[model samples]
Target: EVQLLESGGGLVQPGGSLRLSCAASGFRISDEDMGWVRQAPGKGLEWVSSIYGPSGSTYYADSVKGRFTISRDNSKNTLYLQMNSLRAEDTAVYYCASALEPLSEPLGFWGQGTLVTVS
Candidate 1:
């Protein structure tokens, strides 16, 4: 009941578009929650976006700029983030993490992250 996977472009141009995906498995999509949070060498956790359940409910962070979109597909058990108009500062490690519920539980499951670059 604790699993999530992330995918998308490892590199994107400043004015380009890319899609980031998170898939939840092992747990019923209805009772679980998944999200994207990013960090760098010496930075604190920053919220990207999160989806709740099979309902497709989404919560996006304020720093996500441009044509950023987040959505969920119940049948696929996935949450998606689409980004456009990237910048050097927009580079990401696209970390995947879990939350027990909407602001009701502490964050869980962090990662060392695969090396991701937008250069």
Candidate 2:
């Protein structure tokens, strides 16, 4: 059984930056692409970004920030999401998801989530 655990929650200013990590077990992160999604209170889910594990290619949703990034540390079996130039709308519970074919397929496995608040 695959499992994903995200980093703890954090508080940031509207113009600040944030980085979150997702540690994976039961599978190597490099062997499976991963993506990020978020949902604010009373708001629908939002897709953030995804990273292709094999070639390190990346894809982003139209809503992502210019400084957004999706990366991985193969040796550590971890995935990372970084965002800058934050806004109050960015406050949400972020989740890391696993996808077999990130470009053509949807995310399969998902982390519980880590709340991020922008004050």
Candidate 3:
């Protein structure tokens, strides 16, 4: 079984860095690409980026690369995501997900989601 663990929830001030994680247990973190998605209060999902572990290569969606980062601690099978320069608009439910292939069908796996409120 694969599991994604996330931390840091509730209100966060603007300009702060919000960190969330997704740890994959019972599987190899490097075998798949980890991704982050954003859902504004009532909005739809937005893909942030996908990180390929073996080569440390990542592909960001348009303007997201500069403000977001995705990494992992292979020893613990944990994937980490950090977002900086947060604003009220950035406040939303962030989820960490994984896919069998980079940018492939169905994210199938997801984190419980961490709500970030920016003031």
Candidate 4:
């Protein structure tokens, strides 16, 4: 099983960074790519990027490039997704997921979810 912990708050000022983490347990975190998705208040979901757990290599969606990054701490089996340049449009729920391929494919597993509200 994998769990995620997102620590941040509402109304983040511009230029500040928001960090969200997804930790894996009862599974090998290095075996799959971890991904992030965003869902605004009433909008549809958007794929952010996928991170290779073993090497921390990340591939961002064309629309999300330059604003987000995916990384991990292998020691703790934890994956992280950070988004900067907070803006009102960035307010949404961010979720961490595990899959054989990127979200362009299907998700094998997903974290509970984290709500990120940026103003």
Candidate 5:
């Protein structure tokens, strides 16, 4: 049994920082892999990043290489996305998803998603 839930704060401004959360339940953080994705209005999905744990091996998309970070908080069963230097184009919904063989099968289960506004 595995479930994913995402949460975040309100409006953000350009050149700002936003931290989003993803909660994982009914599964061991170290036993599986999870990641984040983003989508703007009428835009295609963006594969942001992924983390494999309980060992914390992670990967970042080149598009946001220096702009975002993915980390795990195993004790809380949650993962956090710290994104910096926001732009108006960054306004979108952020989702967290998981896969069994993260690198191979990748991101099949998805959370409800949270909206982020860069105004």
Candidate 6:
């Protein structure tokens, strides 16, 4: 019965910051790994970032090296992505995904994703 709900995407000005959320249900967030992936207007999917459990290791793609922060709340079974220094190129549909071995293998589950527009 595991599921993920993603939110917090909308219109924002260039250079503004955005916080994306992924709430998990039917499982303990502390026991799984969560990651963020996004697809630009017509481009392919890009791996944004990932966090292993509440306090485990974290991984990020070189493209978003300095502008993305991934964090989680164990009690709430939720994960978040704090992104700043937005640009028009940042417009995309962001998806929250999970997997057993998130870094090396394909993700097992994914949220519907949220569209973010930067004007």
Find the candidate with the highest TM-score and give its number: 6
Q: What is the TM-score of each candidate against the true structure?
A: 0.73, 0.88, 0.83, 0.79, 0.86, 0.89
Candidate 5 C-alpha lDDT tens digits along 1-119:
67888988569989999999988887756567788998988899998999875667888988778899998787898889999988887788999888775367644688888999888
Q: What is the C-alpha lDDT profile of model 4 across 62-106, one tens digit per residue?
A: 866898888877788887877887777777888777776544664
RMSD after CA superposition, every candidate: 3.5, 3.0, 3.1, 3.9, 2.9, 3.1
Candidate 3 regions off by >4 Å?
A: 101-107
Segments in model 4 whose C-alpha atoms lie over 4 Å from true places: 1-11, 53-56, 100-107
lDDT of 1 by residue, 1-119 (tens): 56677776476667777887777776545556666787654667677787666675778877774456776677897767777766665676777666665577655764335334566
Superior by lDDT: candidate 2 or candidate 3: 2
Best by lDDT: 6
Over 1-117, each residue of candidate 3 has an lDDT whose tens digit, in order, gives 768778766677888887777767656777777788889888899987778657878878776668878887888788887788878888778888886644656456888888888
lDDT by residue for model 6 (56-111), tens: 78899887889889988887788999999988888999999887554776448899
Which scores greater on lDDT, model 2 or model 6? 6
Show the lowest summed lDDT stretch of 10 residues, model 5.
99-108
Candidate rank order under lDDT: 6, 2, 5, 3, 4, 1
- Colliding residue pairs in candidate 4: none
Model 6 weakest 10-residue run by lDDT: 98-107
What is the Cα root-mean-square deviation between model 5 and the actual structure?
A: 2.9
| C-alpha lDDT of candidate 4 relative to the true structure | 0.73
**lDDT for each candidate structure:** 0.67, 0.86, 0.78, 0.73, 0.84, 0.88
| Overall local distance difference test of candidate 5 | 0.84
